[PDB]
């Protein structure tokens, strides 16, 4: 009969943390930013359109140099674009055409992808031969690869559909660490700027912050009412933003362990597929399923702009390291670069 | 443009041409998604050709088929089923030999899965090829175990034909908005090689329908 006692203890600890969070809450960020000058409207237009994909684009990632990018489509293709001149640098076939994530190594020597085959494939782009060959195939996830980001050239972190995250050493192809605790399917993964902590959003309406070196969850955030599909970090590493299928973005803070803002509108009934900040963190760009992106003021919770011009659901969007452009990849088999 | 810039453009055009050729070859290809319960029987339908999801490629009557099995994916279907929105057909394997076995009746679980997949928002006009497996076991089992266990409102003859037709009709009745949906029903016989041919016929119809969408008189 100790299960009931343990459940009561868990409820008591939940009440304790809720009381502590309520005691730490004094004034909302909206009240503080009621006196800061807003931006009336931003107007970003398409400077570049990248064509060549023959199926739905499911992921894209920028390079560190903010000129090269990698896009993944479910036609079995991973394309490296030179965004400046609309040039295709590499077209990598995949053994499995079911790809839901792609990553660019910070050094630019490797790319990664994965999906319904439960395998994270790492491809080497700088070979003595002129082709791009597969460097390794990390296996050991019982669910589909939802996201993957590069710690460095030898370390990778993967989010999967078996309610687990993993940290792999690429050279040995083995799981250095496994992060467990999520009740539902982990759908997103964002790395901190110092790249020592990472947040993962899952289908149990929960975002968890993990320490990579130690391997345990530091804090758990639960404000959403549906499955979180997108996660991203503030540029200062002390806050993050989550998008879910309840049509609401939410900005949480780490050192306060609360939610700071909610970005929602009564005219939006569709989910959020991907979110991304700006370089200064003033703008939050969120891709929706109603075929267009919305640009919110991160401190004023106002829809500062709309990025329309996609004929299908915006699956991914990214912002360059220097903040010069925003690249959106939707299901209409096109990528659009906005400035 | 400098010389290496022109050569880079030439490289881009070459791999664009290769991309177009690969896309045409993939567009000449028909897609089947295989679905069913664990004990329903799928290995009997993939053995008549002669971790992760599994692919089976075969060729019948100058037509290339890929069949995807997602039975090893123990996760939420609602987050990767839109990857199969463009498939030509979905094959659903339902066993007839497990009407009296509970593993909750597992045939009722098959009906629930069929209802969830058929009325999905991503499968508004995707054809169902319903294969009802284990007819010999059904004939050997219906002679002693009645169909009242799975269906209380049977009220019919306890023979093979009546019970089989009742089960088939109970599976057809789960199809809401059946004007734009078509369900093909076949009874799986192990000692025959015509089963894939049936799929071929069903597949052909979809192409014809798609061709009626191509010339603007669908």
């Amino acid at each position: 009969s100790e299960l009931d006692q343990l459940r009561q203890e868990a409820e008591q600890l939940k009440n304790q943390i809720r009381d502590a969070r309520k005691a730490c809450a004094d004034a909302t960020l909206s009240q503080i930013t009621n006196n800061i000058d807003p931006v009336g409207r931003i107007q970003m237009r398409t400077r570049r359109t990248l064509r060549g994909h023959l199926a739905k684009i499911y992921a894209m990632h920028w390079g560190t140099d903010s000129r090269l990018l990698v896009s993944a489509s479910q036609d079995g293709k991973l394309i490296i674009w030179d965004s400046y001149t609309t040039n295709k640098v590499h077209a990598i076939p995949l053994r499995s055409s079911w790809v839901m994530t792609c990553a660019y190594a910070p050094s630019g020597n490797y790319v990664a992808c994965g999906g319904l085959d439960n395998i994270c494939s790492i491809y080497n782009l700088k070979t003595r031969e002129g082709n791009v060959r597969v460097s390794r195939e990390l296996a050991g996830h019982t669910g589909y690869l939802s996201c993957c980001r590069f710690l460095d050239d030898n370390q990778i972190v993967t989010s999967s559909g078996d309610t687990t995250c993993a940290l792999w050493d690429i050279e040995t192809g083995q799981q250095t660490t496994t992060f467990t605790g999520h009740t539902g399917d982990v759908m997103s993964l964002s790395l901190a700027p110092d790249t020592r902590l990472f947040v993962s959003g899952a289908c149990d309406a929960s975002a968890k912050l993990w320490d990579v070196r130690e391997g345990m969850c530091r804090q758990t955030f639960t404000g959403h009412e549906s499955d979180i599909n997108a996660i991203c970090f503030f540029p200062n590493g002390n806050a993050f933003a989550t998008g879910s299928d309840d049509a609401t973005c939410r900005l949480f803070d780490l050192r306060a362990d609360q939610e700071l803002m909610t970005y929602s509108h009564d005219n939006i009934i569709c989910g959020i597929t991907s979110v991304s900040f700006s370089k200064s963190g003033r703008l939050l760009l969120a891709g929706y399923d109603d075929f267009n992106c919305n640009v919110w003021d991160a401190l004023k919770a106002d829809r500062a702009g709309v990025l329309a011009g996609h004929d299908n659901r915006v699956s991914c969007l990214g912002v360059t390291d220097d903040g010069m452009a925003v690249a959106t990849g939707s299901w209409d088999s096109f990528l659009k670069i906005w400035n | 443009l400098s010389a290496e810039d022109k050569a880079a453009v030439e490289r881009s055009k070459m791999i664009d041409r290769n991309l177009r050729e690969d896309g045409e070859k993939a567009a000449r290809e028909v897609k089947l998604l295989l679905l069913g319960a664990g004990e329903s029987g799928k290995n009997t339908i993939v053995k008549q050709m002669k971790t992760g999801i599994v692919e089976t490629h075969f060729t019948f009557k100058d037509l290339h088929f890929k069949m995807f099995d997602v039975g090893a994916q123990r996760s939420e279907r609602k987050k990767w089923i839109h990857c199969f929105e463009g498939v030509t057909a979905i094959i659903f394997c339902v066993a007839l030999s497990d009407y009296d076995l509970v593993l909750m009746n597992r045939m009722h679980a098959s009906m629930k899965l069929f209802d969830s997949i058929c009325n999905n928002k991503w499968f508004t006009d995707t054809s169902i090829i319903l294969f009802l497996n284990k007819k010999d076991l059904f004939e050997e089992k219906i002679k002693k175990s009645p169909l009242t266990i799975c269906y209380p409102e049977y009220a019919g003859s306890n023979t093979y034909e009546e019970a089989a037709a009742y089960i088939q009709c109970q599976f057809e009745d789960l199809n809401k908005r059946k004007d734009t949906k078509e369900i093909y029903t076949h009874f799986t016989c192990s000692t025959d090689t015509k089963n894939v041919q049936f799929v071929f016929d069903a597949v052909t119809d979809v192409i014809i329908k798609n061709n009626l969408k191509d010339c603007g008189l669908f």
Partner: single-chain antibody
Amino acid sequence: VQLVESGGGLVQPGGSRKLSCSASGFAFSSFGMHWVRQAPEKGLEWVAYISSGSGTIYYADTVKGRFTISRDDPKNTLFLQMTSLRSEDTAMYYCVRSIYYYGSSPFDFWGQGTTLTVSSSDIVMTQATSSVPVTPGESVSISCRSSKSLLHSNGNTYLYWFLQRPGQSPQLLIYRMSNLASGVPDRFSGSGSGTAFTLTISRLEAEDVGVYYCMQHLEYPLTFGAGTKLEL
């Protein structure tokens, strides 16, 4: 990666000869291929270029209309048909592979070369230094001047630095005036602006004795320079 040359030999003027290059160890069909010749006592001059897919073909002015360059991709082999041979064609011929995309490594590998002997404007590229004595453990700077500025409007300076050891094929050191080559130690440094460029060896070893060449890739016909020999 092997680029083995074959053919060559002794011919009479007015004859014809086919030079063959067998490629192994790399994707031949994706690369562009250059034929570059070298006179018995002179430097390198560029002869011919075929692109990937055999779409773009360039020739030098002294060889136009007499030589043809072809490429068999299933056989992984490169041909140079040679007609109306004269006394200026006595040379050692080199096959060079070059791949062209963003952040590429052109002119990276050179074949051994084959010897052909017979019976008896554009950008002018100058290297003022010649036969410079050097000492081990000391830095040295090699200069290269151009008639036209190599700095394109896209921010790329199209200067390539090559090294030829005695009795050996040339090897690539610098791609575009700043960039080190793969397998090259961090002792060579490229710098310069406009028409004037320098290559600095910070610490000199015993394997750096050879002839250094600077080439332009801004526009065809891809002029090389003279030799900057250093041997001690």
